[PDB]
Amino acid sequence: VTRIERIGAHSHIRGLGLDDALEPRQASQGMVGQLAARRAAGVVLEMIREGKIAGRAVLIAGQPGTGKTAIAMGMAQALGPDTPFTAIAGSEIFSLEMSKTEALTQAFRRSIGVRIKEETEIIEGEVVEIQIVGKLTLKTTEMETIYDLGTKMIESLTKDKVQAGDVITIDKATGKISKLGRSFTRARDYDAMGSQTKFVQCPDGELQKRKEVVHTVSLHEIDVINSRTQGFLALFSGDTGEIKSEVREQINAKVAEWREEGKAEIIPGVLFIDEVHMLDIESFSFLNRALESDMAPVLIMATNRGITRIRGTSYQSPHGIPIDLLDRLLIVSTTPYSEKDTKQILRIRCEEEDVEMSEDAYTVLTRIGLETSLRYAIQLITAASLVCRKRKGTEVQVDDIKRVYSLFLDESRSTQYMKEYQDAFLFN
Amino acid sequence: TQRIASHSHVKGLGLDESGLAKQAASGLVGQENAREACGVIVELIKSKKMAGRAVLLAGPPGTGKTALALAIAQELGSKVPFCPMVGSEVYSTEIKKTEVLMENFRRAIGLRIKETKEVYEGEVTELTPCSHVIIGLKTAKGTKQLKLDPSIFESLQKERVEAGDVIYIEANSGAVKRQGRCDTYATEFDLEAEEYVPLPKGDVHKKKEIIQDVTLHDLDVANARPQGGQDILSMMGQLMKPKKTEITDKLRGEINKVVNKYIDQGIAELVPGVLFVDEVHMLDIECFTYLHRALESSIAPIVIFASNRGNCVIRGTEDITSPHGIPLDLLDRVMIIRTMLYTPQEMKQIIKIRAQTEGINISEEALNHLGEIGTKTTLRYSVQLLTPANLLAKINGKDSIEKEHVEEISELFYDAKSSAKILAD
Amino acid sequence: TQRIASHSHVKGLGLDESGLAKQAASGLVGQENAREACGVIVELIKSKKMAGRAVLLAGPPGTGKTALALAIAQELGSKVPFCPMVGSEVYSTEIKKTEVLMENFRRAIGLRIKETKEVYEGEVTELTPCETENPKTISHVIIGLKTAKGTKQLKLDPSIFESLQKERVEAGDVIYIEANSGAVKRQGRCDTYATEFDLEAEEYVPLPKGDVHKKKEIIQDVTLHDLDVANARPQILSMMGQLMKPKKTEITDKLRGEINKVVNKYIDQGIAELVPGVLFVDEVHMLDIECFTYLHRALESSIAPIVIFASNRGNCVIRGTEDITSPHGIPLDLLDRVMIIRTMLYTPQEMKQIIKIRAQTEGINISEEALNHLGEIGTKTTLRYSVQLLTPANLLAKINGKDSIEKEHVEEISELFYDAKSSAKILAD
Amino acid sequence: QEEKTRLLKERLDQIYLVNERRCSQAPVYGRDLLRICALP
Amino acid sequence: SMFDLIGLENKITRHEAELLSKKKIPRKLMEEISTSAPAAAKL
Ligand SMILES: Nc1ncnc2c1ncn2[C@@H]1O[C@H](COP(=O)(O)OP(=O)(O)O)[C@@H](O)[C@H]1O
Ligand SMILES: Nc1ncnc2c1ncn2[C@@H]1O[C@H](COP(=O)(O)OP(=O)(O)O)[C@@H](O)[C@H]1O
Ligand SMILES: Nc1ncnc2c1ncn2[C@@H]1O[C@H](COP(=O)(O)OP(=O)(O)O)[C@@H](O)[C@H]1O
Ligand SMILES: [Mg+2]
Ligand SMILES: [Mg+2]
Ligand SMILES: [Mg+2]
């Protein structure tokens, strides 16, 4: 069945393909070539796992199509889902709801997980009888007990309309009641059931259990929850506005106290900002200070620009980043692919897309990709597969590649054809 | 429909079984290579295997780029989602451009949800709370006695359900709706402010397997803000100004997980569709740079772009010129289908099809004259002259368009080139 | 705290008693003149005499400007409010830039409130009224309070009988009574009467410890901005305000003047003590002309904190102007209101000292030859780059089963990762 | 009795399906998470 | 409603959801309940 997630541009990548010594293996876990860059990404991944040093910034820089985002996806896959990995595009911070600095702060705080443990003492059981002073009788498969009821407790039992046969949980620390459902029985079967009705088995073991529960949240979620009375709604709608510095400072201090008490754990993650050259000078200046915080995640960036104009200024800088921020980060450089690496990337893409191709087809597709671009060849893989299926074939041949090459143009051929008829296109 | 639109004649791509474009079929004339490419694109979309692959329709104005996108939409069908948008629609004043693009991406993913509705419907003959609730429903096929969960009694009281009223009860959700009074009591009073509804015809218990198509964006906006809540804050939220909001990535991920769970259960089916972004040259550099990641996603649909610009400056950038007004980086992520200028014969065939679609009878001489005019100015101008020419023909008491009417209309209305020449003088 | 940041080794200005900077102390190396001037600035802050005095740290990148500011902050302690800001933060979407600046100014003025409360708390043991003939009439209400220390009887005013019945105080209930108002507050049944069979949570409380009568001192630290925010929007109007987004508001000068008056009244009454602090504005060159102009008036206020600016832009065009260049991206008018402290480039020896201190703080064992190689790398490239190589080289060494960084690990890490200049060279080619 | 027991079986199947769907789904955050994440 | 998430924030808890998932009545127990279909003294 077609699940929500389908074959995308990075579906074949399932990690960095490194060994225990971080030596890059050729054609491992979907990664081909980029040996030096993959080794550097492994070193950065070890830094992220260690977590000791906050605010380390890494810029993955290279030519278009050299696997920068592929390396980022490999890092995200190799890193466990427990550790946060916030992947955004540079253009996601330009919002009408909040300033750019607020958006970068929220991206920073979303990339730091905090794991909070909590112990509670609850009484869970099936209600046998309730008498309106008051008395309540509960039972499990192993025990039966009767309690005396206070004024607030009898009020809570009445308001929730707890009836005999229900399964309820009452927290001794707070005295609140929650109805988990009603136990099914010979007499409680009905022709229609209410929306809230849930059938549940009688609880096992002892009534008064001691719980240990661990909640995994992030600093941004804590900020939003503490932003206003119904702040957790903004965890859905995103209408968080600009969270005040008071709330953030009080949360940083409370989390520090929690970690000192052993209640919470901090899991520093990664903030990947692809296409980082969309950030403006204000964003870069904010990042220069934001990375100096001890609650800063490890920052990874990707760009393909050369000596280009910094957005928001008239200055030109390498990678479109001012040298203040470039001095604060390490640069990993990608390398253009060889013929062998191109062919192996095409083979892995065919294996993911479930396409069978003849060897001559592999040679011609590799030549096309070397001459035009790797992405164009990847697209022509599925194009030729479709054209072959329309032909009632079972293996993609060179003729199908020539067919799709004639049907779908690349940038160069399309540009040449546009220039040939430039009198018809607008605003040349 | 009833009103003739600029593409009402386009009913498909006109391909044969071998995937080759017929010269004139399904309202499309010429553009053989582009129709065959759009055929391969339709096969890609129907495959439901790939995500986030993108296509750029390139060529001069009036070369059928939008017509071809609508032909793809026709070939897919109504079940497959097809979200059209224009590049200038990203400049919302309520949400960021990337949010508008993400919303349109989610709209193009459909989710067909399959369910059996069970409903008990009939006239109420008895309502006695005992615990449990006993209700008696009557229909044209008989009377049935039902035992209801006591939680439905509150719903029955809220709906003010009494004996003799026609109501329905959902077996899965217990929702009760009082759909008026039974028409048998229409004579109980001569003047009552009540809505009488006929007694249901079928059985009291009705079963129907149904399907509903929803988009992931619909789930996103349903979970964006609480609805139907009886709490005072929910009532105020019902009252407040509805605004688009920058729905968070975490909610989208959770919705994806739940949809995946229900796809695994078998009660939902994914229907990936197409997002059509016309005039993609209008997007700014920020939108294109976000679209890089958006297309690289594994949840994205097939996105069809259309650009008519030449080597123009990318918007939101000073003097950086890229082909089609699209950065080369995004161009490397798309497949380019080239549309060509029409030959005079193809323009004549298009004019004929447009006239036939508008219901206009045109003589051979008028058709030849219109073809000559279109050759001299534009196809769209010749095609637009058909309706006024028919109007003048009907005013002159004629059911067919002659060359005199086309001459008169082309004298009354100028083309863009003629106005430009006049204003140059 | 536990995680290691770029400035986690800065523990203060390494100054002696005579105000001179040691060559290397408290994690700082060199910058003797700049540390001495920062020392005079720290004395200025601690003197509390002056308001609105501005100092500009100016110098090349990686010359310790932010390290010196955080060293000043460490010297001042945690009592003095030190508010870090970056110039990019003024561009808010909820309020005007001048409001952001004024809010950050008021964040750097601290106020310490001292509250002394007298309370009589304990478990109630008797509530006997004292009947009398009026000159049934009661002249006193005797309440007996029990604590773990002992029992006390209070001859309370008869009017307290209304509050006792309002609070439903009964024998065996734990209460506390404040000396001033004389109103009773009930806090639950004493836990000595709680059984394991009855279910209530809030209605039980342990017997108070300590003497029945207590004198409690509560000290709270606030900023003038905290008071501003509190008085600007107090917490059905509350329901609508909490449902809608509580945006920042452009707090009026009227409210700030009223709050200044209230704080002066508290300082006269002795309830409160002012702790004026420091606002640090890094990357101040991100401010626009309107912000700098506002800062002209703000620094002339008698209420303003001491502000520390930092810039490295050199002769650069002022943001929000066209072609108006200024020595630091700051208009010359503001520069006349600030003292400038220059920071100077480091020698290779100072770079080696900083690298060693960083390695110590990160917990990294570095060999002498490895330290020399990394220093020589840092004399090329940048200091920041050489520091950043420390932990990846330590990890590379740990992979190879070495407890200390060897020179080969530094060489390999340098071969893997490149600096801004090497990348510029690759881009040029 | 075959039709009646078939109808009962169908009711039981629908009960099972609805109860499985209701009990299958966990909240994204929950009450306890919000309570524990709240500042004093 | 199977996709309604925000409605669960005021209705259930993660630990309660785990309990509900663990203790849901299986088919055989309902079949048995359909097939089959304490005086206190103060000592
Ligand atoms: N190291 C790699 N191994 C395998 N495939 C790669 C690699 N790098 C790039 N690709 C392929 O090319 C595309 C990814 O290129 P990408 O990383 O987006 O380039 P850029 O650096 O411009 O972002 C994917 O379709 C993927 O199949
Ligand atoms: N291949 C075609 N066959 C038939 N009619 C066409 C064709 N291409 C365009 N038309 C008609 O001419 C009009 C202009 O074409 P259009 O699709 O708008 O071009 P573009 O979208 O590239 O500007 C269409 O609305 C349609 O009515
Ligand atoms: N004189 C010094 N002694 C010790 N550490 C220093 C010194 N100068 C800079 N550093 C450290 O080296 C790095 C330089 O960054 P920073 O001080 O922020 O420079 P900038 O002046 O560019 O803001 C910081 O980690 C800082 O703690
Ligand atoms: Mg990329
Ligand atoms: Mg069009
Ligand atoms: Mg600094």
| Chain D touched by A270 (CB under 8 Å) | no
B115 lies in the same domain as B191: yes
Question: Facing residues of C282 across strands?
Answer: C86
Q: How far is D3 from chain A (nearest CA, A)?
A: 16
Indicate the SS3 state at residue B84.
Answer: strand
Contacts of B101 (CB under 8 A, 6+ apart): B90, B287, B290, B291, B294
> A29: which strand partners?
none
Other CB atoms closer than 10 Å to residue C109's CB: what's the count? 23
Residue whose C-alpha is closest to residue A76's, from A55, A45, A97: A45
**Residue A398 CB-density burial (10 A; 0-12 exposed, 13-18 middle, 19+ buried):** middle
Whether residue C224 is found in the same domain as residue C255 = no
Q: Which residues contact A247 (CB under 8 A, 6 or more apart)?
A: A223, A226, A227, D39
Element containing residue C339 per DSSP (H, E)? strand C338-342
Contacts of C257 (CB under 8 A, 6+ apart): none
CA distance E22 to chain D (A): 9
Return left, alpha or beta for E4; rule: phi > 0 is left, psi -120 to 50 is alpha, else beta: beta
Same domain, A94 and A227: yes
- Residue that has been written with the tokens 């960084």 in this structure: C405
Cα distance between residue A70 and residue B75, in whole Å: 35
Q: Give me A91's structure tokens.
A: 């253009």
Q: Do the beta carbons of residue A417 and residue B338 sit within 8 Å? A: yes
* Interchain contact, B308 vs A426, CB within 8 Å: yes
Cα dihedral C231/C232/C237/C239 (nearest 10): -80
Instruction: Tell me: is residue A64 an annotated ligand-binding position.
Output: yes
* Ligand nearest to C-alpha C355: 3
Domain end call among B222, B238, B271:
B222
- Cα first-last separation, chain A: 47
Rounded Cα distance between C84 and A101, Å, is 14
Sign of CA dihedral D15, D17, D23, D28: negative
Given the DSSP bridges, would you call strands C198-199 and A144-149 parallel, antiparallel or unpaired?
parallel
| Contact by Cβ (8 Å): A182, A199 | yes
Region at C78 (left for phi over 0; alpha for psi -120 to 50; beta for the rest) = alpha
Q: Kindly state whether residues A41 and A88 are assigned to the same domain.
A: yes
- Token pair for residue A131? 């008498």
User: Does B332 share its domain with B205?
Assistant: no
Is A184 a member of any domain?
A: no
Structure-token match 């479930």, residue found: A354
Q: Which of C215, C230, C245 is the last residue of a domain?
A: C230
Q: Where are the beta strands (DSSP E) in B69-164?
A: 82-86, 109-129, 133-139, 142-148
Q: How far apart are CA A420 and CA A413, in angstroms?
A: 11
Run of H or E including C338: strand C338-342
Q: Could you identify the residue written with the tokens 């479109």?
A: A320
Pair (C85, C153) in one structural domain: no
Contacts of C178 (CB under 8 A, 6+ apart): C117, C118, C119, C185
Structure tokens at A199: 């059938």
Q: How many C-beta atoms lie closer than 10 Å to residue B308's C-beta? A: 24
Query: Residue A278: CA atoms inside 13 Å, Cβ hemisphere, count?
Result: 24
Interface test with E, best of B109, B258, B267 (most E CBs within 10 A): B258
Give φ, ψ of C382 to 5 degrees: -145, 165
Helices (H), A146-280: 151-159, 219-227, 234-237, 245-261
User: How many other C-beta atoms can be found within 10 angstroms of the C-beta atom of residue B207?
Assistant: 11
Residue A259 falls inside a structural domain: yes
Per DSSP bridges, beta strands B109-129 and B165-170 are antiparallel
Using CA coordinates, name the residue in chain C closest to B232: C239
- B83 φ/ψ angles, rounded to the nearest 5 degrees: -95, 110
Q: How many Cβ atoms are within 10 Å of C233's Cβ, its own excluded?
A: 13
Q: How many CB atoms are located within 10 Å of the residue A212 CB? A: 8
Indicate whether A225 and A279 sit together in one domain: yes
What CATH code is carried by the domain that includes residue A80? 3.40.50.300
Residue E32 φ then ψ, to 5°: -65, -40
Report residue C345 as tokens: 């480039």
Q: Where are the alpha helices (DSSP H) in A215-338?
A: 219-227, 234-237, 245-261, 281-290, 323-326
Q: Residue C65, annotated ligand binder?
A: yes
Type of residue numbered A400: D
Whether the CB-CB separation of B32 and B21 falls below 8 Å is answered with yes
Contact A198 E20 (CB under 8 A): yes
Same-domain pairing of A296 and A346:
no
Range of the domain at C354: 346-429
What's the CA dihedral at C240, C243, C245, C251 to 10 degrees? 40
Number of H helices, E strands in chain D: 2, 0
Rounded Cα distance between A281 and C290, Å, is 18
- What is the CA(B307)–ligand 2 centre distance, in A? 14
Query: Using CA atoms, how far apart are residues A140 and A15, in angstroms rounded to an integer?
Result: 48
Q: Is position A68 annotated in a ligand binding site?
A: yes
> What DSSP designation does C197 have?
S
Q: What is the DSSP letter of D39?
A: -
Which of A177, A86, A98 shows the shortest CA–CA distance to A130?
A177
Residues B82 and B135 in one domain: no
Query: Are C219 and C117 in a shared domain?
Result: yes
SS3 at position C114:
strand
The domain boundary residue, chosen from A310, A337, A364: A337
- D26 contact residues in E (CB cutoff 8 A): 8, 12, 14, 17-18, 21
Q: How far apart are the C-alpha atoms of A411 and B324, rounded to whole Å?
A: 10
User: How many Å apart are CA A268 and CA A114, to the nearest integer?
Assistant: 8
Residues A288 and A295: beta-carbon distance below 8 Å? no
Check whether residue B250 and residue B298 sit in a common domain: yes
Beta bridge partners of B213: B112
Instruction: Report whether C62 belongs to an annotated binding site.
Output: yes
b/e burial code for range E4-25 (CB count within 10 A of at least 16 → b) = bbbbbbeebbbbbbebbeebbb
A76 occurs within a structural domain: yes
Residues whose CB is less than 8 angstroms from the CB of residue B309 and which lie 6 or more positions away in sequence, other chains included: A425, A426, A427, B281, B324, B325
The verdict on C220 and C132 lying in the same domain is yes
Alpha carbon distance C298, C86 (integer Å): 17
Final residue of a structural domain among A337, A352, A385? A337
**CATH number assigned to the domain comprising residue C220:** 2.40.50.360
Note whether C179 contacts A: Cβ–Cβ < 8 A: no
Pair C139, C225 in one domain = yes
In this structure, which amino acid lies at residue A356? E
Query: Taking phi first (over 0 means left), then psi (-120 to 50 degrees means alpha), and beta for anything else, what does residue B349 get?
Result: alpha
Q: How many CA atoms within 13 Å lie on the side-chain side of B202?
A: 9
* SS3 state of residue A116: strand
Of the candidates A18, A68, A85, A77, the one whose C-alpha atom is nearest the C-alpha of residue A332 is A68
Instruction: Output the domain CATH number for residue B422.
Output: 1.10.8.60
Rounded distance, CA C350 to CA C367, Å?
17
Size of interface A-D (CB pairs under 8 A): 40
Instruction: Extract the tokens encoding E4.
Output: 């309604």
Measure the CA–CA gap between A29 and B312, rounded to whole angstroms: 41
For residue B156, what are its two tokens? 């029955």
Task: Dump the DSSP string for A338-401.
Answer: -HHHHHHHHHHHHHHHT--B-HHHHHHHHHHHHHT-HHHHHHHHHHHHHHHHHTT-SSB-HHHH
Alpha-carbon dihedral sign for residues A419, A365, A61, A50: positive
Distance CA A185, CA A208 (A): 24
Q: Map chain E to HEC letters.
A: CCCCCHHHCCCCCHHHHHHHHHCCCCHHHHHHHHHHCCCCCCC
- CA dist B305 and B294 (Å) reads 14
| Co-location of A82 and A231 in the same domain | yes
- The count of other CB atoms within 10 Å of the CB of residue C285 is 23
A153 domain residue, yes or no: no
CATH of the domain at A399: 1.10.8.60
The tokens of B131 are what? 């615990």
Together in a domain, C131 and C199: yes
Q: From the CB of residue C182, how many other CB atoms can be counted at a distance below 10 Å?
A: 13
- Looking at residue B64, which CATH number applies to its domain? 3.40.50.300
Nearest to A293 by CA among A47, A53, A104, A54: A54
**Residue A385: HSE in the Cβ half-sphere, 13 Å Cα cutoff:** 20
Residue type (1 letter), B134: I
Partner-chain residue, chosen from E5, E16, E30, that has the shortest CB–CB distance to A178: E16
How far apart, in Å, are the Cα atoms of A104 and each of A93, A272, A273, A285, A331? 7, 11, 10, 11, 21
Q: Residue B367 is inside which H or E element, if any?
A: helix B364-376
Q: What is the C-alpha to C-alpha distance for residues C56 and C65, in angstroms, rounded to an integer?
A: 9
How big is the B-C interface in CB pairs under 8 Å?
A: 9
Number of Cβ atoms within 10 Å of the Cβ of A186: 11
State CA A362 to chain mean position distance. 34
Partner chains of A (3+ C-beta pairs under 8 Å) = B, C, D, E
CB-based contact C384 A326, cutoff 8 Å:
no
Instruction: Give CA–CA dist B15/A112, Å, rounded.
Output: 54
- Of C306, C338, C336, the closest CA to residue C42 belongs to C306
A38 vs C138: CA distance, rounded Å: 89
Ligand 2 shell residues, CB under 6 Å? B 6-7, 27-31, 61-67, 350, 353, 379-380
Whether there are 3 or more C-beta pairs closer than 8 Å between B and E is yes
User: Tokens at residue A188, please?
Assistant: 């409680």
Three-state secondary structure call for residue B356: helix
Minimal CA–CA distance to C308: which of C297, C299, C317, C319?
C299
Distance of CA A260 to the CA centre of its chain: 28
First vs last Cα of chain E: how many Å apart? 52
Rg (CA), chain C: 31
Pick from A233, A376, A303: which is nearest to B226 by CA? A233
Q: Which of residues 271-330 of B touch A (CB under 8 A)?
A: 272, 285-287, 289-290, 292-293, 295-300, 308-312, 318, 323-324, 328-329
Strand partners, B82: B274
Nearest CA-CA partner of C295 in C89, C53, C73: C53
Domain final residue pick, A337, A370, A400? A337
Tokens 């008698």: give the residue.
Answer: C302
- How far, in Å, from the CA of A58 to the mean position of ligand 1? 19
- Domain containing A366 equals 338-428
- A222 shares a domain with A107: yes
Name the residue of chain D whose CA is nearest to A191's CA.
Answer: D11
Handedness of CA B63, B68, B69, B74 (dihedral sign): positive
Supply A369's token pair.
């990709």
**d(Cα C308, Cα A120) in Å, to the nearest integer?**
48
- Asked if A98's CB is within 8 angstroms of C384's CB, the reply is no
Scanning C77-138, the segments in alpha helix (DSSP H) are: 97-107
Distances (CA, A) of A186 to A165, A180, C344: 12, 20, 87
Rounded (10°) CA dihedral A217, A220, A222, A225: -120
Q: Assess whether chains A and D touch, using the rule of 3 or more C-beta pairs within 8 angstroms.
A: yes
What sections of C234-329 are H helices per DSSP? 237-243, 253-269, 289-299
If one counts every other C-beta atom within 10 angstroms of the C-beta of residue C23, the result is 12
* Enclosing H/E stretch for C311: strand C306-311
Single residue among C308, C330, C345 that ends a domain in this structure: C345
For residues A99 and A239, membership in a common domain is answered with yes
CA-nearest residue to A184 within chain D is D15
Ligand nearest to the CA of C343: 3
The pairing of strands B142-148 and B133-139 is antiparallel
A313 is in an annotated binding site: no
- Given a contact cutoff of 8 angstroms between Cβ atoms, the answer to whether C26 and C38 are in contact is no
Which token pair is C223? 């900023």
In sequence order, which ranges of B159-284 are alpha helices (DSSP H)?
216-222, 232-239, 249-265
Shared domain check, A77 and A224: yes
Q: In units of Å, what resolution does this entry have?
A: 3.4
Contact predicate C93/A99, CB 8 Å: yes
Shared-domain flag, residues B160 and B61: no
Distance CA A163, CA A137 (A): 11
The verdict on B332 and B395 lying in the same domain is no
Cβ neighbors of A153 (< 8 A, separation 6 or more) are A134, A136, A175, C199, C200
DSSP single-letter state for residue A53: B
Structure-token pair, residue A213? 């529960």
* Cβ-based neighbour number of residue C322 at 10 Å: 6
The number of distinct structural domains making up chain C is 3
Residues within 6 Å of ligand 3 by CB = C 6-7, 10, 27-31, 61-67, 354, 384
Number of Cβ within 10 Å of residue A295's Cβ equals 22
Q: What type of residue is A396?
A: V
Q: State the Rg of chain D over Cα.
A: 19
